[PDB]
């Protein structure tokens, strides 16, 4: 298919809530070499987030049920095996998009904004892997997540206003990485508060197109900081 036809298919699949189809379509667009438009970056991100997010949600449910299943080994064993099947799907999916980012998207990004977008995605999907990784494998995924977030963060601070949705959303996810993955609430809170404070300080840079996303992310920063100060 032409690129234009794949993008049309991705948009149809998104409307139809068929996210496997949407991801396959945007994977093809990516592998056909070129650089993505702004809308195509969002289609790609929406598709893989919904595909992986289904598994993350399913994993949390089965994990919960495993916990409540005290005193019944066959139930417990089934919950374990099914959790591991979900983890394996999640790993397939994350490694799929991580290969697209590392092989096609990041090395060919022309603009710093695109590059931050992909590097943030790389941090995100290594973070999702880390959520279910173990042993020495976790050490690798956690380290790769942190490095991708760090590189995105360096570029965003010099190239983007602090009200920029990508810069704000990167800080949000990096702070979640620090809090949930690295168990470092001071680093997490410092990053989240600093991102919030720098956005407010230059609130006059927030334009009409970014308003909805940037103000939502600012609220999520606050929501997280409120949560993280209960369980300090």
């Amino acid at each position: 298919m032409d690129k234009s036809e794949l993008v049309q298919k991705a948009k149809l699949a998104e409307q139809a809530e068929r996210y496997d189809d949407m991801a396959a379509a945007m994977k093809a667009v990516t592998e056909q070499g070129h650089e993505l438009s702004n809308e195509e970056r969002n289609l790609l991100s929406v598709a893989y987030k919904n595909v992986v997010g289904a598994r993350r949600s399913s994993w949390r449910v089965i994990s919960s049920i495993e916990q409540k299943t005290e005193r019944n080994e066959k139930k417990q064993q089934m919950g374990k095996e099914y959790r591991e099947k979900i983890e394996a799907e999640l790993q397939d999916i994350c490694n799929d998009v991580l290969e697209l980012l590392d092989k096609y998207l990041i090395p060919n990004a022309t603009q710093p904004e695109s590059k931050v977008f992909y590097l943030k995605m790389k941090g995100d999907y290594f973070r999702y892997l880390s959520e279910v990784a173990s042993g020495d494998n976790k050490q690798t995924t956690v380290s790769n997540s942190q490095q991708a977030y760090q590189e995105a963060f360096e570029i965003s601070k010099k190239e983007m206003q602090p009200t920029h949705p990508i810069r704000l959303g990167l800080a949000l996810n990096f702070s979640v990485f620090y809090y949930e993955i690295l168990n470092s609430p001071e680093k997490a809170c410092s990053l989240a508060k600093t991102a919030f404070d720098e956005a407010i300080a230059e609130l006059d840079t927030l334009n009409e197109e970014s308003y909805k996303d940037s103000t939502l992310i600012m609220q999520l920063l606050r929501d997280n900081l409120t949560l993280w100060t209960s369980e300090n």
Partner: peptide
């Protein structure tokens, strides 16, 4: 309850 993270599509 979990931490909230960034929406998957963003204005660029």
């Amino acid at each position: 309850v979990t931490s909230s993270s960034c929406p998957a599509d963003l204005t660029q």
